[PDB]
Design an enzyme around this catalytic site. Structure first.
Site, short mmCIF file in Angstrom:
data_model
loop_
_atom_site.label_atom_id
_atom_site.label_comp_id
_atom_site.label_asym_id
_atom_site.label_seq_id
_atom_site.Cartn_x
_atom_site.Cartn_y
_atom_site.Cartn_z
N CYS A 130 47.99 58.27 55.92
CA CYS A 130 46.53 58.23 56.20
C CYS A 130 45.78 56.91 56.17
O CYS A 130 44.88 56.73 56.99
CB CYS A 130 45.82 59.23 55.30
SG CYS A 130 46.38 60.93 55.65
N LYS A 179 34.72 60.58 54.14
CA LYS A 179 36.18 60.63 53.98
C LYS A 179 36.82 59.38 54.56
O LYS A 179 37.71 58.80 53.94
CB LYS A 179 36.76 61.89 54.64
CG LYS A 179 38.29 61.98 54.72
CD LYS A 179 38.99 61.78 53.37
CE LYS A 179 40.49 61.66 53.58
NZ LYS A 179 41.30 61.56 52.32
N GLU A 194 39.66 66.48 52.44
CA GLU A 194 40.58 66.52 51.30
C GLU A 194 40.76 65.13 50.72
O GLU A 194 40.80 64.16 51.46
CB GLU A 194 41.92 67.10 51.73
CG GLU A 194 42.89 67.30 50.60
CD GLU A 194 42.31 68.09 49.44
OE1 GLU A 194 41.72 69.19 49.65
OE2 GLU A 194 42.46 67.61 48.30
#
Ligand SMILES: NC(=O)C1=CN([C@@H]2O[C@H](COP(=O)(O)OP(=O)(O)OC[C@H]3O[C@@H](n4cnc5c(N)ncnc54)[C@H](O)[C@@H]3O)[C@@H](O)[C@H]2O)C=CC1
Ligand SMILES: NC(=O)C1=CN([C@@H]2O[C@H](COP(=O)(O)OP(=O)(O)OC[C@H]3O[C@@H](n4cnc5c(N)ncnc54)[C@H](O)[C@@H]3O)[C@@H](O)[C@H]2O)C=CC1
Ligand SMILES: NC(=O)C1=CN([C@@H]2O[C@H](COP(=O)(O)OP(=O)(O)OC[C@H]3O[C@@H](n4cnc5c(N)ncnc54)[C@H](O)[C@@H]3O)[C@@H](O)[C@H]2O)C=CC1
Ligand SMILES: O=c1ccn([C@@H]2O[C@H](COP(=O)(O)OP(=O)(O)O[C@H]3O[C@H](CO)[C@@H](O)[C@H](O)[C@H]3O)[C@@H](O)[C@H]2O)c(=O)[nH]1
Ligand SMILES: O=c1ccn([C@@H]2O[C@H](COP(=O)(O)OP(=O)(O)O[C@H]3O[C@H](CO)[C@@H](O)[C@H](O)[C@H]3O)[C@@H](O)[C@H]2O)c(=O)[nH]1
Ligand SMILES: O=c1ccn([C@@H]2O[C@H](COP(=O)(O)OP(=O)(O)O[C@H]3O[C@H](CO)[C@@H](O)[C@H](O)[C@H]3O)[C@@H](O)[C@H]2O)c(=O)[nH]1
Ligand SMILES: [Cl-]
Ligand SMILES: [Cl-]
Ligand SMILES: [Cl-]
EC number: 1.1.1.22
Lengths: 460, 458, 460
Positions: free
Chosen positions: C276, C220, C161
């Site tokens: 994150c 990612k 994502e």
């Protein structure tokens, strides 16, 4: 089962010459040809004066030479005719480039691999006797696979050597074990049995170990690391003995009577020399770094660091004992070979001790019963050598007007010298520095004469 | 002078077995073992001895009450003794100057003081405890400052070389006996009197005599050499895993060199035992004191390698179990530091367990000889939440993700691994930290285990 | 071709709820069920007060909830009935054991994988949307293969994502790209294509990237590292600007006009927060160390080290400016969220600056327009919080009797406050520390009022 009847050995050095001589001696039905690019070395092997000094070697060579043992510069024809080809070339530490001072130099091995495949047709067994990094045999296999021909079948084995110089003939005729590595394949096992059958002419089958190629390569490096470690371990105890007033020889006895420790390789010294221990431990250290094993690398690095410290501290003991200056002082160096019963000087502690004293501007007079004067000059050269080094014909010349006598090699004769005579002609105070413990039990006698006698592993 | 009564201060893994063998071999000598620990002494006088050692029970029962005695009456035992052994513990200090390095000598000194308080006449005081070099001098100095008319206390060193698990064999047939004492006439007469005891069963050629400080150094050195062999083969085991070599094949090749020898080349999760680490650290601590930093760093590597071997074994288990072991049931087979003992002191099993507990794993621990109360103490909350002590190994492996063998007990190789696999969670792993499952790998793989071992590539 | 008609998403957080909400919104024929162990969180998703603040989310949820979007704590039945299962559970840095402070904690991921296999029969596609170390998907595949049932056929994909909180709905409806990783095998490609087909309801096929699971996982981690790096880079420049009399906003403009560099993510700040960036960069660093890449490890560690320094030096600036002591000083903290347009505080720089000032014994009065007061209490708790921390209902309360006002989050409202009024009731001298550059162009007016105004990237 395949019978080997022609052997070619590439590299006529301290491994190739003696190993092949013994094979020829024990296997009259095999033709053994030892080859080398060094013409003077090959010419000396074919002469009454061999290029190396090894007890008993001359007798083995003369029993076989010209019958089933040959020495030649014709590498190509030796390879072509051979059933089995030994690679027994040198593998020095790289002095340049990537891994300088650590990595093995494989340029000579590679040159052998290339020449073999260029001169080979049909079936041959190619046997790596040189000490190499783990997986080097895979590179040889790759060179061979990439240059394949119809019906070319070159089988690659590892067959490390365990002889010690000075005891080479004894060790080759009665080895504790023979180690052979090869593939698990049928062809690999056929090659392995062929080589076993050679050694079985004089080695019991129970003393021949067979494994895979990688275990064989590692075993050799590991064996040398364990041996070198025993010496660095007892040398570290020597420093403790000096500090606490114990005796390393007495401590070594108490340690060695534990049968799990064993009583071999516990003789303290100025430090281990020889062509292989340092380079083989550093090889192992370089491999570990390359394989993400830094803990294992720093573990084995300590074996070398301890050896270097032993040497350095022996040198500083000399300079400190001589009133902290040796500039312009004559100092006798007795023994240049890396151990007794060889003329070989490769990595001898004598080189290192001599260079530390030359750095101070001492005047060294060097005596060794077996090392040629020309080699001593080369070893101490990059001058400094012309200004500071004299090579003596006898030990009495070397000690004449000396401030100090430094024993670096354990030749039997040094214990038997006339030390009363030596004392008379030395400058005063006269020192003896025994780096080999060969004068033990003469200390009272030497002190009565008037020497300050110092040795490793005994407090002053 | 003939030694007819012996007192031993310290009734542990050394004092108990050593004295039991002395009594067994010398029926004319009264041997009294003493200790401040009443329950330990009570156990030595019971049908259940405080330690498990093969052959010990039979030796104790042949002498106890005849010429072998266990007592908390320390004062009278010293009073009546011709020879007093000091055999108390010398752990690494966990506090103060030299924390984690120096030997703790508080128990030694307490012995020295008690001896001088309770002694008259002539006695030989023998330090069998493993002590720093020059420790015997401290005892001498304590005695000289506390003289009495006609008090004559002689101080010797007499290090012990037995290994637990083989204590009785080692004691009855020692490779050597080592005695240190002063070069004086009194010193040599003390040394000879102790020799005379050992010569009831030990050949005189196997008895080495020296000074106290050389004796002391030899013991520390011997232990360092032994530990080094293990760390060295363990370092090679890591290389083997990285190169496709097999450490057992390499060990065999290495060991056939008679200059190297073939003993102590069994790779493992790491050496344990109360003595190897603490004695190497003692030696390292001495070097620093003597301005030998290079020698200190050399021997420190033996310990650093051992700690790495344990750490990488734990990391291998966590990595193989998909990088998480939180809430995962894991079987620990073997808690003792080696086989044939109930001793857990510094066992690699403690260290591996604690690493897995740090992750929040649910450990089920099985050992055939270690008491469950000792495992609870060693791992000590976190222990209540995470640790179960299993009555048998099948209980331990029931619903487990992994089986971890830390101690080389003979029984682990003989288990029904088909049965175990059936009730394990999947995939099922075996981590063999002792190489005891070698030659069962093909069978275990066919059953469905992922089997990993030290010194062999995965 | 396989049609996904029922989706289950395990994890109803800032990823699982919004992502599923948008799928349901754009795919009225797909039934989408979001599940979680957290009952109060599921209860809130089903209420008029959603558990997170995200602009536009409420509208999207209400257009679908009860129709083709459901939120439930019945994890088992949702897995059982699904054609596709998303794993969107948290993957925080481990605070214990091996890799403490560096490695990703995968306990939640594994709990999901085990639950899926126990509650699954027949064919399902299992898609790892959680950010995971490289090769994590391999672990899920191994769990599934070791726990087979007759007919059970679970396929594993990576689908990372890229939404940013505060702009999640815009980001999900118009993504720069979609990334899907799967096996090169026919079954994997049929799995990959099935997932593409979902996204193709609203994302151009040209913007959908397909690859293997490990290149997807790594992309990612690398993307977050490059983003975080731009921020640490401009923050490093902010320090240089303060030291040389340059302005970081003018330098950012000049740099950003190079179309090769680009003009995004060059806003200097007290430091990046959010759940994150730090953990994902540390995951990357940890992976490097495991793969024997220490150089790559230290390269990316600098992104975090610079961020830590930017925070620390901002706290130091407040303490140094306030006469080197803030013990007992009232200080207003304006903004606790890690960025504007979210109620999320995870790794907010506001937490760190608060903790530095609490360590001095300052009395903090904290205001944020969106963050719940109980979350602020929890964040600043290890007592200290009781003694030192007050949560303010409005910003004027926070600044009343304050010595300094510290802006840590770029909420639009702070620029608009009545600073003449604020100044009257502050202690003197009154300070403003703008950690977000939201007060640019007000510096003359602020100074005129009387403030010592300090900001990142501008010399005092
Ligand atoms: N010297 C020793 O005690 C032992 C040495 N080893 C190992 O055996 C190997 C050889 O050792 P040494 O005999 O001492 O070395 P060495 O240097 O004495 O002999 C090697 C010989 O190979 C020759 N050579 C190099 N490249 C060649 C080529 N391409 N074609 C033909 N000849 C070539 C050299 O000219 C030299 O004479 C090394 O790998 C060493 O680690 C193993 C056991 C014992
Ligand atoms: N455990 C082994 O395999 C061997 C140990 N050693 C050495 O032997 C010594 C003792 O070792 P272990 O028997 O294993 O220790 P241990 O801890 O098992 O036993 C020593 C005993 O001494 C007692 N003690 C301590 N202070 C006392 C005092 N002031 N008065 C009376 N009793 C006292 C303790 O209560 C304990 O029961 C250590 O120095 C060790 O390094 C040497 C060879 C082998
Ligand atoms: N927050 C963001 O902007 C983005 C996050 N990510 C990644 O997505 C993942 C999730 O992030 P967030 O939604 O912020 O996490 P979060 O913590 O807000 O939500 C995760 C949810 O999963 C639930 N959960 C954990 N284990 C469970 C289990 N075994 N069964 C059912 N539910 C379980 C928790 O109860 C929690 O509500 C992380 O890997 C993160 O790296 C990726 C892109 C963006
Ligand atoms: O107790 C000892 C034993 C040896 N050394 C010294 O260590 C070095 C090596 O001696 P030695 O090992 O006997 O001779 P090498 O010719 O170096 O042989 C070693 O190196 C060979 C080449 O790899 C191996 O084949 C042998 O097994 C191995 O012993 C020499 O300087 C010795 O004087 C000591 O100082 N103390
Ligand atoms: O090849 C080997 C040999 C031993 N070990 C381990 O090393 C540790 C110690 O083993 P061992 O030496 O057999 O027992 P210890 O009771 O610790 O005995 C040592 O420590 C005593 C106390 O000082 C000495 O007296 C002994 O001579 C010395 O062996 C144990 O964990 C063993 O499992 C290995 O991992 N590999
Ligand atoms: O120029 C900038 C840009 C951002 N930030 C700060 O950086 C942090 C992260 O901001 P942002 O990236 O906008 O929000 P996140 O919710 O953390 O989103 C990031 O983290 C997500 C989780 O993996 C990814 O999916 C997104 O692509 C990635 O931008 C916040 O404290 C911001 O205030 C700055 O200081 N200066
Ligand atoms: Cl001679
Ligand atoms: Cl058993
Ligand atoms: Cl606002």
């Amino acid at each position: 089962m395949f019978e080997i009847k022609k052997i070619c050995c590439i590299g006529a050095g301290y491994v190739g010459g003696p190993t092949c001589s013994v094979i020829a001696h024990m296997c009259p039905e095999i033709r053994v040809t030892v080859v080398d690019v060094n013409e003077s070395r090959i010419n000396a092997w074919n002469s009454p004066t061999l290029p190396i000094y090894e007890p008993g070697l001359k007798e083995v060579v003369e029993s076989c030479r010209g019958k089933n043992l040959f020495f030649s510069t014709n590498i190509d024809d030796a390879i072509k005719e051979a059933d089995l080809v030994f690679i027994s070339v040198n593998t020095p530490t790289k002095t340049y480039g990537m891994g300088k001072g650590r990595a093995a130099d494989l340029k000579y091995i590679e040159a052998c691999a290339r020449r073999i495949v260029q001169n080979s047709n049909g079936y041959k067994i190619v046997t790596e006797k040189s000490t190499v990094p783990v997986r080097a045999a895979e590179s040889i296999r790759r060179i061979f696979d990439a240059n394949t021909k119809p019906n070319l079948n070159l089988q690659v084995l590892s067959n490390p050597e365990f002889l010690a110089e000075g005891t080479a003939i004894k060790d080759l005729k009665n080895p504790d074990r023979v180690l052979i590595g090869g593939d698990e394949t049928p062809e690999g096992q056929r090659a392995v049995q062929a080589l076993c059958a050679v050694y079985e002419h004089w080695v019991p089958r129970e003393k021949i170990l067979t494994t895979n190629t990688w275990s064989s390569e590692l075993s050799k490096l590991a064996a040398n690391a364990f041996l070198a470690q025993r010496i660095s371990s007892i040398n570290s105890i020597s420093a403790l003995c000096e500090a606490t007033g114990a005796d390393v020889e007495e401590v070594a006895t108490a340690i060695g009577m534990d049968q799990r420790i064993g009583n071999k390789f516990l003789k303290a010294s100025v430090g281990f020399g020889g062509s292989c221990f340092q380079k083989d431990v550093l090889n192992l250290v370089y491999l570990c770094e390359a394989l993400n094993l830094p803990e294992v690398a720093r573990y084995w690095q300590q074996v070398i660091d301890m050896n270097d410290y032993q040497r350095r501290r022996f040198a500083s003991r000399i300079i400190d004992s001589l009133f902290n200056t040796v500039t312009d002082k004559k100092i006798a160096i007795l023994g240049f070979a890396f151990k007794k019963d060889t003329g070989d000087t490769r990595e001898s502690s004598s080189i290192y001790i001599s260079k530390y004293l030359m750095d101070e501007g001492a005047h060294l007079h060097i005596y060794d019963p077996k090392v040629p004067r020309e080699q001593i000059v080369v070893d101490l050269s990059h001058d400094q050598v012309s200004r500071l080094v004299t090579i003596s014909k006898d030990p009495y010349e070397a000690c004449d007007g000396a401030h100090a006598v430094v024993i670096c090699t354990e030749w039997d004769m040094f214990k038997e010298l006339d030390y009363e005579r030596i004392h008379k002609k030395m400058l005063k105070p006269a020192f003896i520095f025994d780096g080999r413990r060969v004068l033990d039990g003469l200390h009272n006698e030497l002190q009565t004469i008037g020497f300050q006698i110092e040795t490793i592993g005994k407090k002053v």
